From a paper:
Glycoside hydrolase family 71 (GH71) includes α-1,3-glucan degrading enzymes which could be exploited for biotechnological applications; however, the family is presently poorly understood. To increase our understanding of GH71, we have performed a phylogenetic analysis of the family and detailed biochemical analysis of two of the five GH71 enzymes encoded by Aspergillus nidulans (AnGH71B and -C). We present the first structure of a GH71 protein, AnGH71C, including structures with carbohydrate ligands. These structures revealed a conserved acidic dyad (DxxE), found to be crucial for activity, and active site water coordination consistent with a classical inverting GH mechanism.
As no protein structural information is hitherto present for GH71 and to establish a greater fundamental understanding of the family, we pursued the structural determination of AnGH71C by macromolecular crystallography. The structure was solved to 1.33 Å resolution by molecular replacement using a model of the protein generated by AlphaFold232,33 and all residues of the protein could be modelled into the electron density map, except for 9 and 12 N-terminal residues in chains A and B, respectively, and the N-terminal His6 purification tag. Crystals of the apo protein and glucose-soaked crystals were of the C121 space group with similar unit cell dimensions and contained 2 molecules in the asymmetric unit, while the nigerotetraose soak was determined in P1 containing 4 molecules in the asymmetric unit. The protein contains an N-terminal (β/α)8 barrel, a short linker (9 residues), and a C-terminal β-sandwich comprised of 8 strands which packs along the side of the barrel. The β-sandwich domain has an immunoglobulin-like fold with a topology most closely related to Fibronectin type III (FnIII) members but contains an additional C-terminal β-strand (βE) compared to canonical members. The βE strand interacts with βA forming a four stranded sheet packing into a 4 × 4 sandwich which, to the best of our knowledge, is the first observation of such a topology. The interface in AnGH71C buries 21% of the sandwiches’ solvent accessible surface, as determined by analysis with PISA40, which includes several hydrophobic and aromatic residues along both faces and is stabilized by 14 hydrogen bonds and a salt bridge. The N-terminal (β/α)8-barrel domain is most closely related to GH99 (Cα RMSD between 2.8 and 3.1 to GH99 members), a family mainly containing retaining endo-α-1,2-mannanases as characterized members. The most distinct difference between the GH99 and GH71 (β/α)8-barrels is that AnGH71C lacks a region of ~50 residues found between β1 and α1 in the GH99 members, which forms a large loop wrapping one side of the substrate binding cleft.
Author numbering: 32 to 431
The structure:
């Protein structure tokens, strides 16, 4: 294999892991390694008393299991008055053997913090630093005064700049604005599968649908310098692709996430990550597999007791069951959704098809030359009633 200079990272919420041990970190890291992810962005806050402890555990774990990590300073909490502490943290970790390196320099990033100047940090740390903050305006990325080396976009979902929820499908419009402004500097593109949040302070969806697959196809077209997956473990916004960890701290998101595994989305990601790193325009399918996802009820069901209203944007969703097939040769896909039954011929490669949702049991089957290659029952029966509004999805898979 030829050496590559493209890398995939994943956003990790340090704020929810006060009780993590080194072993807990290692478990997440092994699953990320198996997906082909190169590093976790350790998103952390100045206000958490356990930040230094958990950064130390994560860097130790990464060095022990041949993984890499870098810091995402979360400027919802860190502030422009924190140069001294940010500098001291980078002095500790920029040359750590577990620190992710890009072109010989320690990668550092942010959530927000567009106005934070990296100059004083870089000039105080002997080891080179490569600063790729999260920037909100593509125009600023092209004119920033903060000594940046690239920009990371958080525009992972369909949006038009405003505060209305817009329909999909997702496009590359924002990616292409960042790339135009960045010129020779690097772009770290966001990849997210889904979005649903349901708190007193934030209650909306974005219109994602086929996004768990479609976004990876956009990455092969676009070939950004870096990718960050949003997210490994942000349960509260439903975009996690990592496991539901036993050791994280619940914020109320257990209501819509505890029984909703998302691990099978890593089956889609794995071959696309390999193709992205190799510069290939299509993935290589190693074996026959299927990944499916769907919401728990039809979108129009009224709840019996939710103290929060329905999320903003749900009228734009479809009542669909989504199926990504990963096929070595062409085959036939059959889906039963309640009383509904559908069939479609599917090409070799990785293809997503959506099917009308019916209340009841869900069934999946792929047949080739008249014989069933893979199949089984969906792990969740769709219902026609709910106690609370849950616009997260259940995800599952079958593998030959």
């Amino acid at each position: 294999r030829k050496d590559s200079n493209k890398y995939v990272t994943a956003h990790f919420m340090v704020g929810i892991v006060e009780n993590y041990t080194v072993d807990d970190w290692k478990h997440d890291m092994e699953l990320a390694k198996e997906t082909g992810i190169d590093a976790f962005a350790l998103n952390c806050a100045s206000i958490d008393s356990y930040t230094d402890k958990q950064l130390a555990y994560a860097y130790e774990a990464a060095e022990e299991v041949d993984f890499k990590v870098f810091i995402s300073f979360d400027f919802a909490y860190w502030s422009n008055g924190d140069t001294a502490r940010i500098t001291s943290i980078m002095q500790t970790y920029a040359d750590h053997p577990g620190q992710f390196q890009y072109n010989g320099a320690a990668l550092v990033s942010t959530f927000v913090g567009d106005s934070f100047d990296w100059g004083p940090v870089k000039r105080a740390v002997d080891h080179p630093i490569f600063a790729v903050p999260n920037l909100q305006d593509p125009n600023w990325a092209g004119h920033a005064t903060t000594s940046i080396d690239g920009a990371f976009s958080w525009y992972a979902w369909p949006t038009d700049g405003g505060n209305s929820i817009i329909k999909g499908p997702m496009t590359t419009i924002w990616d292409d604005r960042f790339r135009n402004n960045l010129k020779d500097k690097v772009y770290m593109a966001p990849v997210s599968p889904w979005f649903s949040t349901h708190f007193n302070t934030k209650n909306w969806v974005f219109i994602c649908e086929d996004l768990p697959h479609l976004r990876w196809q956009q990455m092969l077209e676009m070939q950004p310098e870096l990718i960050e997956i949003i997210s490994w473990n942000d349960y509260g916004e439903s975009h996690y692709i990592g496991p539901y960890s036993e050791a994280h701290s619940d914020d109320g998101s257990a209501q819509w996430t505890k029984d909703f595994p998302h691990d099978a989305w890593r089956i889609i990601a794995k071959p696309y990550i390999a193709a992205y790193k190799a510069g290939e325009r299509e993935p290589t399918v190693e074996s026959d597999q299927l990944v499916y996802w769907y919401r728990p009820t039809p979108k129009a069901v009224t709840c019996s007791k939710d103290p929060l209203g329905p999320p903003n944007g749900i009228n734009l969703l479809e009542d669909s069951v989504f199926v990504t097939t990963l096929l070595t040769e062409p085959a036939t896909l059959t889906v039963g959704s309640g009383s509904l039954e559908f069939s479609v011929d599917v090409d070799a490669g990785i293809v997503t098809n959506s099917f009308p949702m019916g209340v009841g049991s869900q069934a999946f089957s792929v047949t080739r030359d008249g014989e069933e290659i893979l199949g089984g029952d969906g792990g969740l029966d769709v219902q026609d009633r709910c106690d609370y509004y849950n616009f997260n999805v259940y995800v599952g898979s079958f593998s030959a």
